[PDB]
Structures are given as C-alpha cells and as structure tokens.
C-alpha cells in the first residue's frame, strides 16, 4: 500500500532530477488521470498523498466557472456559502474520500507520467546546459524549417528554436547550415521547445558590436540605443566617455570595415551609425542622416517633433517604407510630421505669421490700432485663455472694452476648439442611409459606423463575426440584420 509507494520513491534513480516533492506531485497527477478512468465523470482530483507522513486522500476540484456541464467541476463566481468556503476562485472541495486504491491501470498511469516527468527533468537539464550564455553569439545547425519557426541544434542534444519574428523576412534556410543568432529568452519549465535564439531583435547588434568593436566591452564607447527593421535597416546611437575617441571612424573602422563586417555577418542589413546626443532635438536631427533639417519644432507634451527636411531630398530622407524616419521614430520613440514642399516649408516662421484669417476681429473695437502680437505667440488659443497682467502691459491702449472683446473672442475660441474636437472625434459619420435602416437606432448606428464601415454597400459584405462584440445586439438579431442588408444590397438587385 503506502509502504510500497515509499519504497518506490526511495528507489527512484533520479532523486536529484525528481526529489520527493516532484515525485508525490507526479503521483497527484497520476491519481487524477486514474480517477479520470475510475468514474465516467471527468473530474480533476488532487489527492495530496502526503508522501513523508502517510498515504493518499482523494479530493474534488470545483473548477470555478459559470457553466454547469460536468457539475462535479462547476461552481459559479460566488457559490461559497456552504462549507464556509467564502472564496470565489480556487475554493475546491473534498467530497469523495478514499476512492479506488492503486490497481494495475493506476500503476500504468503512474509509470507513464513518471517517465515523461523524467523526460521533463532531462529537458530542464538541457535548459541548464544551454543557459549561462543568454545574450551571447552562439553557433548552431538547424534541423527543420517551418512557416512560423525553425529548429536548431548545437550538439549534445541541445535543441532550440528561432521564431518567425526572430528570423529575417528573406533569410533563406536549409537543414545543415550553420546559422548564428543570440540566445535571448529561456523557459526552464516550458512544455515544447525550451531555448530561444533570435536574429532580428535590436540588442543582438549590441553583442555583435561587443564581439566586433574592441572599444565596447570595456565601456569606452557606451552603446546608448538602437532601433531595428529585421534584415532591412538598423540605426544605432552611441555615446563615448573619452574625448579623443571618434565613434564615426572607430566604430565604423577603416573606410567601412567594422560596420560592413557586422552587416555581412547579419546577412545584408543596412546599418546607420549615429552619435547620441543628450538633447532629443539634436538627437532626431542626427538620427535621420543622411539628411539635413533646418526646421525644428519640438513639443514635449504631445511627444511630437516637426522635423522637416529640405525640399528635394525627401525621396532620400524619408526613404522606402519611411525607414530612415520610422527607425528615427523608434530611436527616440516619438512621432514626426513631414508635409510641406514649397509653401513656406520652414514650419516655424510660417505658422508664426500665418494668421491673417484667424484674427480678423480680435482687437476690433477699432481695427486701426495695431496688429496682433507674435511675441507672446497667439498660437495656442486655449492656454492663452488666462495670462497674468505681468505681461499684459506692453500692448498700449488695453482699455477695458478691449479686454472685454478679448474675453468674447476667447469664448469664440473655446467654441471653435470644441467644434473642431467634436468634428475630430466624429470619425464615424452615420449618414441617413445608416440611420434609416430598420432596427438600427442612433446608438447602434454610432457603434456600427465605429466598427469600420460608414456606407451601406460594404455592410452586406461582413458576417456575424465581423459584427460580433457589438453594443446592443445578439448574434441572431445580428444575422437577421446582415441578411436584411444583403437583401437590400445584393438580393434585391436594385440600384
């Protein structure tokens, strides 16, 4: 009985891969799978065999969920009054006590679960044998390639995987080749694959430089940041502590030798080596090289930067897929804006004195007084709603009617910003062809237009799933609505 189980746990060879605790939790799982066979009711049964003290005592798990199928494992979110459970989740019961003891199929289940557990322990062992180099360049041959991941071998049954996002979009693979990446994530208690190598994640380049550049590794050239686009283009900003060190010609090497070697090892990946500055403005200026910007407008709160290159170099400054900009938007992590070409592309002197249509009636008790003042800016219209009288003296002739007209125009500015906001938040536009549909009130039209369709033709070409999670309709009324839409648009044969 229990003495036999004690003898087994004393006689297990891998007491170190599986000590007493893992052995009796494995027997917990084994008795659970055995109770799955004892009763046709599929119930999870923890049994806490209490290896050291005594023997098993069967329990019953409630598996708290609103459902009722297999009621041996069904409890709603709050059914915890009886037995003084008083627990929403995790409250489990001990209803059936001393179920069928060990028999031959119980021993079969225990045998198979303990051998697969020894296998899992060996998987933890190979995890330990592949670890200690997490974040270092490693050699490895591949075994199989798939659409979502690839398997890799190093020797000594060292198995790892490289996911789809960890690979380059165009890096062709074939079994037997010796590919290299960096070991980034480890899961010592996973179920399938254990070790994870990558080739597209940014910090890889760092250790690449850490194995290429003799400067880095001793921290004379501290690597600040790096943004990447897998196999396509990677930018990097670095900082040096010494003053006689030139990161443009030391990290690059001799006429493009170090960065070229790193790119050729990466498999043809463009690298842009940029110096990091402690100012985000100059940093984004230097980041988009090769490019030149004479128009800088930085906003701290909006996290935006108006960095507009000169007219003519756009096709090179933005580049394909906006890479030189996109990587920049990943280097600092901010948003940018490049729209103008010819009409006052300075974007600072332009918006400083382009207000001839806004201030038509601001100091308009008598327009023949003075133009609007740009020294304060008059370019916010909302934070300008209240300015102290410390700077409200320089405008000569600020009578009381003038400040009352100022307050009236500030009320007008509040009205116009509220109008612009309500036109800006209204990116649904439920038109009359969307409201007149039977069973679609104003709110349902709001939601339906917020789903992504704003017309009536494209309504008939979305299914129940495409409408699902709607606010105010069930799936059957959903099907009826989309059927009526298809009848009006497709089955009716009307135009």
């Amino acid at each position: 009985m229990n003495k036999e189980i004690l003898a087994v746990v004393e006689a297990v060879s891998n007491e170190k891969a599986l000590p007493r605790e893992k052995i009796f939790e494995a027997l917990e799982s084994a008795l659970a799978t055995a109770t799955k066979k004892k009763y046709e009711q599929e119930i999870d049964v923890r049994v806490q065999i209490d290896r050291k003290s005594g023997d098993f005592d069967t329990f019953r798990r409630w598996l708290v969920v609103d459902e009722v199928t297999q009621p041996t494992k069904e409890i709603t979110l709050e059914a915890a009054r009886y037995e003084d459970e008083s627990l929403n989740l995790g409250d489990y019961v001990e209803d059936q006590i001393e179920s069928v003891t060990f028999d031959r199929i119980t021993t079969q289940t225990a045998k198979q679960v303990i051998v697969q557990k020894v296998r899992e322990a060996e998987r933890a062992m190979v995890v330990d044998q592949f670890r200690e180099h997490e974040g270092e360049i490693i050699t490895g041959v591949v075994k199989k390639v798939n659409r979502d991941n690839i398997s890799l071998d190093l020797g000594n049954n060292a198995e790892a995987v490289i996911l789809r996002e960890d690979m380059l979009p165009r890096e062709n693979f074939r079994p037997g080749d010796r590919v290299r990446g960096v070991l980034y994530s480890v899961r010592p208690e996973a179920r399938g694959a254990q070790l994870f190598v990558t080739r597209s994640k940014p910090e890889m380049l760092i250790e690449l430089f850490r194995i290429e550049v003799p400067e880095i590794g001793e921290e004379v050239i501290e690597i600040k940041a790096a943004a990447r686009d897998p196999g396509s283009r990677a930018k990097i900003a670095v900082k040096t502590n010494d003053k006689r060190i030139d990161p443009v010609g030391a990290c690059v090497g001799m006429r493009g030798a170090r960065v070229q070697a790193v790119s050729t090892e990466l498999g043809g990946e463009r690298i842009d080596i940029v110096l990091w500055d402690d100012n985000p403005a100059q940093f984004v200026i230097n980041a988009m090289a090769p490019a030149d910007v004479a128009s800088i407008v930085v906003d701290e709160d909006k996290h935006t930067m108006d960095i507009a290159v000169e007219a003519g170099n756009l096709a090179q400054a933005i580049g394909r897929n906006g890479q030189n900009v996109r990587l920049a938007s990943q280097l600092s992590g901010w948003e940018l804006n490049v729209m103008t070409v010819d009409d006052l592309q300075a974007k600072h002197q332009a918006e400083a004195h382009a207000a001839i249509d806004t201030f038509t009636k601001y100091l308009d008790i008598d327009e023949d007084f003075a133009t609007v003042l740009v020294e304060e800016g008059f370019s916010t219209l909302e934070e300008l709603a209240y300015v102290p009288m410390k700077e409200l003296l320089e405008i000569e002739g600020l009578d009381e009617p003038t400040v009352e007209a100022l307050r009236e125009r500030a009320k007008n500015a509040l009205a116009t910003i509220a109008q612009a906001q309500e036109e800006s938040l209204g990116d649904n536009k439920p038109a009359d062809d969307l409201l007149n549909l039977e069973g679609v009130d104003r709110d349902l039209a709001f939601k339906l237009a917020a789903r992504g369709v704003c017309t009536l033709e494209d309504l008939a070409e979305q299914g129940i799933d495409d409408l699902a999670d709607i606010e105010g309709l069930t799936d059957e009324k959903a099907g009826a609505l989309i059927m009526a839409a298809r009848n009006i648009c497709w089955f009716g044969d009307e135009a």
Binding site: Q48, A80, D84, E85, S86, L87, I97
Partner: protein
C-alpha cells in the same frame, strides 16, 4: 456556548447538563468527549455556538483552535478553521480567536469556525495591519518587576532574595540552574503568586513540561492565570507542540503590546525532546546530542525579548544539573551564553534543610542598572560587597536568618541601616 465555560467546572455539572440535553449516558465517555457531545447537541438546538481558542497551523493551510483547558493539545472540540480565514486575516500561530462555529456534518471531523468576532481581545482590523514579532526591535529590561509580597511570609523571602540577589524585569531572559531535590517547585510557585498578587497587570503564563500529574493539578489551581502543561503522558511530539504553541501565543500577545511571563520547568527535558525529534546528520556531539538539535531550542529560548513599541516577553526556564551524564550539562552550557539573566540554586545547602538555597555568588543580571533605582543600586552593590568575602555557608545562613528577622526588603535596608 464557550467550551472553557463548560471546562472550568468538573465532569459532574457536564453530566447533568448532558442529561438536560437528553443524550446517551455521558459519564461513560471522557469528560472532554462529554463536552464534544454536549456542544453537538447544543448545535442541534438550532443555534450558532460561540467558540474560542489559539490557532495551530498544519501543512495543509487550515487551522485548529486549541483550547486553554485542554493544555493546547489535540481534542474533539478543536475548532476547524477553513483556509479562507488565513487568506483574509492571515491569523498566525498563537492568535487567540473567538467567533461563531457550526456543528460537524457527518463524515466531517470537528466544528468549523464561520466568522471571527474577536482577535486577541481586539478588533479584527488590528490583526491584518500589525507589526510582527520577529520584526520587532529587541531591548533590555527597562521596567522593574518587584517580587516581594509585602506581608512577610516564610516563603515570601524566596521572592525577596531574588530582589536582593538579582532583580527581574520585563523582557528579561532568566535561567534557573539547579540540581534535582533543591526547591525549584515551591520557588516558582511563590514567584508566580508574588507576580500575580503584587503585579496583576501583567499576564501570568506558568508552564510545566514533563512533571508529575499531581504537580500539574497543584499548579493549575493554586496560581492566577492560565496553566498549560504537558507531563510525561505525552511524547516529545506533543511536548514540542505545546511548547511552540505557548511561545507563539506569547509572541502574538507581545505583538498586541502586552507583557507575558513564561515560567518553564524544565528546559533540559525540552532540549531532550528536541534532540529526540531532529533528523540525524550522521554525527553526534559530546554527550550524545545531534548537531542541529540546538537550533530550535535556541529559537524557543531567544523568543523572549523587550520591545520598543509595546509589550514584553520574559521567560524563566529552569536548567537541570547533577544528572550524571554530559548531554544535559551540555544543554546548560549552550544556554548560559544565550540568556542574559542567570540564577543558580544550591542543593549542597538544600540537603542541610537550609531553604531557600540560592547561589548568591554566581547569580547576576546583565544591565542590572536599568532594573533598580540609583541609591538602591549603590546599597545592593555594598551588600554584595559584604556578602562576598564570607564563606558560602556563612553568606547563606546570614541571608536566611537576617531576612527572616525582617519582613520586607526596604525594611531590610532600613534595618541594616
């Protein structure tokens, strides 16, 4: 109702109360079994019972409410405590909990505590937001606990002598080193009585480990306060159980800013039990004690401390010598260096029918200046100066004669003049 409310009274009232409840012959089963059956019937009357007890936590996570009169041991009236209470309040070991309990349905074990109504004689809100015991800041004995009774009995001297030999205060760690047949029993008896009579503010918790049941009955119904004991009727398992349980109760009561006096006799039998219940490390020490056999005894001994925030824990554990073997003496040694308060008793003078025979020479207290006023400290220094150069018998007969010739201790100072 409360179990202790049915426990203060003998089995006779329990029998007639069960006859009132209309059950099977009660006198046949045990009196605590009588209480179990009686509470079962009381719950059958359609009312929620109100129970109380100190918490004992097993490996599974639930708890048991051990009662005071059951010597903090396993009983049929040990209230089951669902883990949900340990999830909400996280009541640790020794927390005196009182609340509503329900009868055990069939196939169950004991009564289950539904909702706590009293946590350590305080609101349950203080239970969750509270500073812990091993988390405190230990200090020395600041407040002095006087021992003399004040009416001049013959064994009142047995308290005065302490106040004349080495003072005792809150948070101290006291040892009583004495051979068998020396006078420890009556000593701790009058010590407890004097602490209770002169200082009824502190919580008297007398402890007894592995003695005669007649001694347990003499101790329980003679002194003020709770008297939990475990005689030789219980093995080392129940010994260590009751020991850790009373020590955790004291820890919780000090956490609640209260003073706890723990008079234990003896510490050597506790150490023997501990050495009995430790895993073997493949080696033995001098005397026959395991290596790690002292860790848990040392923890239990050093649980006593004086706190900055509130409360104190002062233990007086008696050490036993002259046992013939080494291991016990070894314990004594391992215990002289951890306690900051020694008190040594004489058997060579006790055989002469000379009581009380306290070793005035090797008695002492560390930081004893915080245990007594200035000029009284000067006078005690001069008195020990007088006691030193004379022989052992000389000092002891001088002590007993001139203190029985006195009534109180300050009267003794004013008579030595």
């Amino acid at each position: 109702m409360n179990l202790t409310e049915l426990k203060n009274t003998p089995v006779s009232e329990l029998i007639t109360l069960g006859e009132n409840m209309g059950l099977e012959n009660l006198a046949r089963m045990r009196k605590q079994d009588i209480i179990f059956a009686i509470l079962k019937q009381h719950a059958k009357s359609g009312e929620d019972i109100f129970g109380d007890g100190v918490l004992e936590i097993l490996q599974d996570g639930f708890g048991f409410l051990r009662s005071a009169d059951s010597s903090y041991l396993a009983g049929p009236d040990d209230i089951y405590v669902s883990p949900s209470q340990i999830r909400r309040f996280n009541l640790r070991t020794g927390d005196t909990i009182s609340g509503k309990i329900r009868p055990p349905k069939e196939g169950e074990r004991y009564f289950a505590l539904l909702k706590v109504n009293e946590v350590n004689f305080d609101k349950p809100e203080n239970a969750r937001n509270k500073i812990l015991f091993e988390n405190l800041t230990p200090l020395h004995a600041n407040s002095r606990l006087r021992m003399e009774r004040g009416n001049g009995s013959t064994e009142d001297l047995t308290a005065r002598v302490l106040d004349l030999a080495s003072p005792i205060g809150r948070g101290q760690r006291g040892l009583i080193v004495a051979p068998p047949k020396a006078g420890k029993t009556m000593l701790l008896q009058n010590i407890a009585q004097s602490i209770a009579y002169n200082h009824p503010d502190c919580v008297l918790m007398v402890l007894l480990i592995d003695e005669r049941p007649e001694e347990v009955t003499e101790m329980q119904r003679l002194v003020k306060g709770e008297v939990v004991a475990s005689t030789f009727d219980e093995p080392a398992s129940r010994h260590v159980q009751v020991a850790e349980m009373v020590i955790e109760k004291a820890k919780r009561l000090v956490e609640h800013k209260k003073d706890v006096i723990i008079l234990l006799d003896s510490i050597t039998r506790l150490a023997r039990a501990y050495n009995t219940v430790v895993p073997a490390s493949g080696k033995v020490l001098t005397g026959g004690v395991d290596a790690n056999a002292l860790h848990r005894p040392k923890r239990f001994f050093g649980a006593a401390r004086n706190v900055e925030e509130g409360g104190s824990l002062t233990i007086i554990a008696t050490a036993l010598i002259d046992t013939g073997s080494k291991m016990d003496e070894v314990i004594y040694e391992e215990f002289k260096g951890t306690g900051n308060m020694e008190l040594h008793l004489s058997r060579k003078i006790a055989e002469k029918r000379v009581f009380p025979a306290i070793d005035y020479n090797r008695s002492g207290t560390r930081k004893e200046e915080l245990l007594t006023t200035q000029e009284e400290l000067q006078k005690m220094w001069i008195l020990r100066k007088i006691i030193h150069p004379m022989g052992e018998i000389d000092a002891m007969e001088f002590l007993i004669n001139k203190l029985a010739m006195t009534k109180t201790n300050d009267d003794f100072f004013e008579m030595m003049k």
